[PDB]
Amino acid sequence: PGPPEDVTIDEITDTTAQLSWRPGADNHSPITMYVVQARTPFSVGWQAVSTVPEVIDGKTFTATVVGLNPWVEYEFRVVAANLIGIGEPSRPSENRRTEEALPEVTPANVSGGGGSKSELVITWETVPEELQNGGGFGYVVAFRPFGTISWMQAAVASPDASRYVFRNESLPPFSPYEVKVGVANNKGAGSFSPVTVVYSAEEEPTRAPITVLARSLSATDIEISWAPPGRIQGYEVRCWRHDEKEENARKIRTVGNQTSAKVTNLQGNALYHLAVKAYNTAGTGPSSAMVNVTTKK
């Protein structure tokens, strides 16, 4: 058997396409069967497809291919079969894109967090092109503060996107948000991912430590304590000698709820200046008042 010719896509729908071929070299024994194979940007080589009629005899020359993927560029080719063997494939038809259809798949791994002041960061995994099922693909990000009713939809019109940031100066710091994302193309809208909870961005502490105490333990050691007045991971206390500039100040940081520290490796009979700030991940808050201590001799 030998290659058929003149493969054409007569009509095409969102899931089907009508094909038409003309028979070619059939060696000597008659043609008993025709099969259709398809190729896509996602296919490894040529792939078999379902057809109506379910089987294409040698006397049939048009069929509908069924079960195609919406909004995908398809190539087709037809292979003849003889009682002696399988023929050579025909040359591929011209590439045609299927019609549009609604999107069915929702983005994966919706999460987020972080960002600059007064922001809310939402992330997701981008939906691949084969599953976008239409042009004009985009994402719908719906969010609301935990315990509230009304939603807020933002449309992210880039199909390749995987991130959305909402900024507004009335945003509470490090606050919880219900978040879900969805998909939509030109035909309409898809469904939504499951609801997850994303926390807004965090700001540095707003108040400064109070009632700073400081006493010299030895010629090289100074003890310093304070009281706490939003989240606080610890405290940064800085310390610089009188003759040195504040820019270069020895800084050491508290981790935990402890409200004191010891500054060591100092010079004997020297005046030092110390103050302590609160800090979170966002940065250092305001500085407490300054205290002045001279080490022992």
Numbering used by the authors: 598 to 826, 833 to 900
Please give me the paper's original passages concerning this structure.
Contactins (CNTNs) are neural cell adhesion molecules that encode axon-target specificity during the patterning of the vertebrate visual and olfactory systems. Because CNTNs are tethered to the plasma membrane by a glycosylphosphatidylinositol anchor, they lack an intracellular region to communicate across the membrane. Instead, they form coreceptor complexes with distinct transmembrane proteins to transmit signals inside the cell. Finally, structural analyses of five CNTN–amyloid pairs indicate that these proteins interact through a conserved interface involving the second fibronectin type III repeat of CNTNs and the copper-binding domain of amyloid proteins.
We designed three variants of chicken CNTN4 by changing interface residues to alanine to validate our structural results. Residues T751/V752 or Y781/E786 were substituted with alanine in the first two mutants, whereas all four residues were mutated to alanine in the third. Introducing alanine residues at positions 751 and 752 in CNTN4 resulted in a fourfold-reduced affinity for APP. Residues Y781 and E786 interact with H137 in APP, and changing these two residues to alanine led to a 20-fold weaker binding (KD = 115 μM versus 5.4 μM). Finally, introducing alanine residues at positions T751, V752, Y781, and E786 results in a protein that does not bind to immobilized APP. Importantly, this difference in binding affinity is not because of any gross structural change brought about by the introduction of alanine residues as evidenced by comparing the structure of chicken CNTN4 with a mutant that includes all four alanine mutations. Consistent with these crystallographic results, mutations of residues T751, V752, Y781, and E786 to alanine in chicken CNTN4 that prevented binding to CNTN4 also abolished its binding to APLP2. Overall, these binding analyses indicate that the interface identified between the FN2 of CNTN4 and the copper-binding region of APP represents likely the arrangement of these two receptors on the surface of cells.
